[model samples]
Target: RTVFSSLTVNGVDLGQGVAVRVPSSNAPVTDIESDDIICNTGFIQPVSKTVAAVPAGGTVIAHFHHTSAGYVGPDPSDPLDPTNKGPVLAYLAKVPDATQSDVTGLKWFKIWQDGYTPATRQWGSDKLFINGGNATFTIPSCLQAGQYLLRVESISLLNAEQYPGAQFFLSCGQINITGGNKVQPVGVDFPGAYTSTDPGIVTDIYEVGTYTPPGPAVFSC
Candidate 1:
C-alpha cells in the first residue's frame, strides 16, 4: 500500500499533517462509486486548519510513503512496490473553504497525469519509485485565485485486468492561491468520473498497450 504523506510548494515543506487531509491508513480505495474515491477513506476531518499558500503557477511536489506514519527507514516498498505499475495524477477543486470537512459534490479538474509509455516501457509508478516517491507538477497560471483542494492520486495496475483491481492511493491538501486570472476550468465529479469498466481502470499491465487514464484531459490556462 502507498500513502500520500505530505507535500511541498515551491521548495517549502508543508510538513506532515499540515493543511493536508491524510487517510487513517495506507490502504487502496477499490470502489470508484464510494465517497472514498474523493479523498480516500477515514479522513472525515482535516488534520490541520492551516491552509498552505502558493502562487498560481508555483510548483507542487507530492510525497508518498508506504505507511501513514511516513518514512520509517528504507524498505523495498517504502513508497510503493516497484512492480505496482500505473499512472500518477493531480487535480484541483475550487472550494469556499479549503479546510471544510465536507468533500462531496466538489467539481475537480485534472492538472497533470503521467500514464504508461509503451516506447519507454515505463509507468508513472516507476517514475515515482525512481524519484524517491516525489511527484512534481505545476499549478495552472490562469486558475482563479482562491481557496482550493489539491488532490494527488497514484494508481496501481498490477492486477487491474478485472473490476476493482485497480488500487487508488490518494490524498488532498488545502491551499490558497494568489495572483491568478479568473479562469475556472470545466470539471468532473469524482464518483461520476470513473467506472470499473473504464479503459484505464480495467487493464493488464503485462500486456503491451497504451493506457488511457480514467479522467478528463488535463486542463491548461
Candidate 2:
C-alpha cells in the first residue's frame, strides 16, 4: 500500500508525510474561509522517501482516503453555496535537484484538472470521494524524459476571497520518468500561478458571471 496522510493546519509547520498547507489563520474553519497555498509537492519531502519510476505517458492513479467524518471536499449539489463547491487539480514538474534552496519556486506543468461542471455549474465533489475511489492523471506522451514531481491538489473554494480565502489539500509524488517522446512542455511557477484577483477566487459562484479558474493556462504539450 502507498503511504498517505491528511494536510496540516495553518498553525502546524510543514512535516514529513504532510501533503499540503494553507494560509495561516487564527480560526481555521473546515472548508469555510482562507487563502490557498500550493502544497509543497516534492519541494521538500516526497510522497514517499524513495521515488518511484513511471513510464512517460503512463497512467497514474492516486488514491485518497479521508480520516474526517464527511467527504474530503464540499458537496457537488451545493455549488450555489460557497461552502460546498470543490475543484480538484493535478500538476507535474521537473526537479533539477531535490536539495535546491528555492524548491517551491520551481516551475510546474498542469497536465490535468477537474471537478467543474460547466453544464450544471456544479462541482464533482461528491463523486470524487467514495469508498476506494481514486483520481487518475496522465503524463504527457511527448513529455521530455527527466526526474519529476507530480502534484495532486484539491481546492476547497468556500472561502476564496481577495487574499487568503481558499483552502488547499495537496500531495506530492516523486517520479523518474522514462521513455518519453522528448518533447519539452511549458510550465508556470507556483505562488505566482494564483492570485486573489482571478475571477474564480474573488467572487461567489452563485453570482452570474464568467468564471476563470486560477493557475496559468494548461501546458500546450
Candidate 3:
C-alpha cells in the first residue's frame, strides 16, 4: 500500500486507525518494504468530508486533486488541464464499507477530465484496490497522464434514493508522472486507529510533483 504523508492517531480512528496485517486477499497490496505506509506521532491534516450534510439516502464523495501539479480547471480552456492535468491515470475512492453492492456504482471512474463526457468504464469497478469498506474505499490504478485527481463518489448507502452532496475539494496536491510509467499504484492502512462509522472513515492520498521548477528546493551552490 502507498501512504503519502504523516498518519496520525488522535483516538478518532476506528481501533485507532484501520490497521491491517496480511490482507485476506491482496487487492493491489504492495510490498511492506515500500515506504508507502506511515504512523506519525501527532496531529495531521487528514483529508476529511463531513457527512452531516449528506442526504441520508443519497451519497457523499470525497474528492482530492493533487493541486501542486500546476494544472487548473473545470474550464478545459484553462491551459492547465490539457497541458498540465488529466486525463488522469490512477485514482482512489473511499467509504466506510469496502464490500457493498453499491460500490459497483459509486466507485471511481478514470477519465480524461478534458474529455469525460461518456466516461470509460474501464476506470470504474474494475480497479477497486481495497474492499469490505463497510464504509471506505482506496481504489487505485496505474493508468498514466500528465496530472491527476483523487475523486470519491458516494452513490447510496441506504436502499433508497436521496440527494448527493455538492461538496468537492482538492484533498491533496498536484500529481505528476515525470517519474516514468511502470510505477504501479500502492496503498497503506491506518493502523493506530480503525474507523468504520459516522465520521469514522479517514483516508489520505498525496503524490510528489514535478521537480523541474527547483524553487521548492534549495541547492547549496
Candidate 4:
C-alpha cells in the first residue's frame, strides 16, 4: 500500500491535507470506472480547505509514503514497494473552485507522464524510490491562470497482465495557478479516459518490450 501524503511547491511543504487530498489508507484503486478514479476513495469526506498557490511553469513536487504520517523510519515501502513497477503521470483540471468537494464529473488533461524505459530498465516507480519518494513535474506556462486540481498518479503493473489487475495509487492537490496565458488544453473524463482493454492497462510490464501509458498525450504549449 502506497499513498500520496502531501505536496511541495517552491520549497513550501503544504502539510498533510493542506492542499492535497489524503486518503484514509494506502489502498490502490483498481476500478477505472469507479468514481474513486477521480481522486481515490475516502477523499471527498475531508476536503482540503487550503489552496496552495503556484506560479505557472513552477515546479510542483509530490510526496508519497507508506502511511499518511509520512516518511515513517526509512521503510522500503515508504513511497511504494520497489517491486511495484509502472508509470507515473500528472493531470490538471481547471475548476471554478480549487477547494471543491464534488470531484465527480470533472474533466482533466494530461500534463506530464513518465513511463517505462527499456534502455535503463526503469519504471517511473523506480525513479520515485531513487528520488526518496518525491515525484516532480511542472505546471504548464501556457495554461490559463485559475483554480485547478492537480492529479498525480503512480500505477503498479506487477499484477497487470489482465483486466482490473493494475493498481492505481493517486491523489489530487488543490492549486491556484497564477500568471499564465489563456490557453487550456482539451480535457478527458476519468471513467472515460481509461479502459480495461487498453494495452497499457492490461499488459505485463516484465514481458513487454515497449509500453504506452493509457490516456491522452501530455499537452504542450
Best by TM-score: 1
Model 1: runs farther than 4 Å from truth?
A: 44-46
Please name the candidate that would achieve the greatest lDDT relative to the true structure: 1
What TM-score, over all chains together, does every model reach?
Answer: 0.97, 0.68, 0.19, 0.96
- Which has the higher lDDT value, candidate number 1 or candidate number 4? 1
Better of 1 and 3 by lDDT: 1
By TM-score, how accurate is candidate 2? 0.68
Clash counts for all predictions: 0, 7, 43, 0
lDDT of 4 by residue, 1-221 (tens): 68887889987887876788888888899999998999897763566788889999999998988776677687968788999989999999998898877888888999999898998898888999888878898899998898999999999999999977999999988899999999988999987899987898898876989989989998988
Query: For model 1, what is the alpha-carbon lDDT of residue 182?
Result: 91
* Candidate 2, poorest ten consecutive residues by summed lDDT: 21-30
Q: Candidate 1 lDDT, tens digit per residue, 63-112?
A: 99988877788899978899899999999999999988899999999999
**Alpha-carbon runs more than 4 Å astray in model 3:** 1-145, 164-174, 179-221
What lDDT does candidate 1 reach at residue 64?
Answer: 92
Model 1 lDDT vs. the true structure? 0.89
Candidate 2: residue pairs that collide = 34-164, 34-165, 34-166, 35-164, 35-165, 35-166, 159-165
> Candidate 3 — what's its lDDT?
0.21
Model 4 residue 53 lDDT?
91
User: Each candidate: what lDDT?
Assistant: 0.89, 0.52, 0.21, 0.87
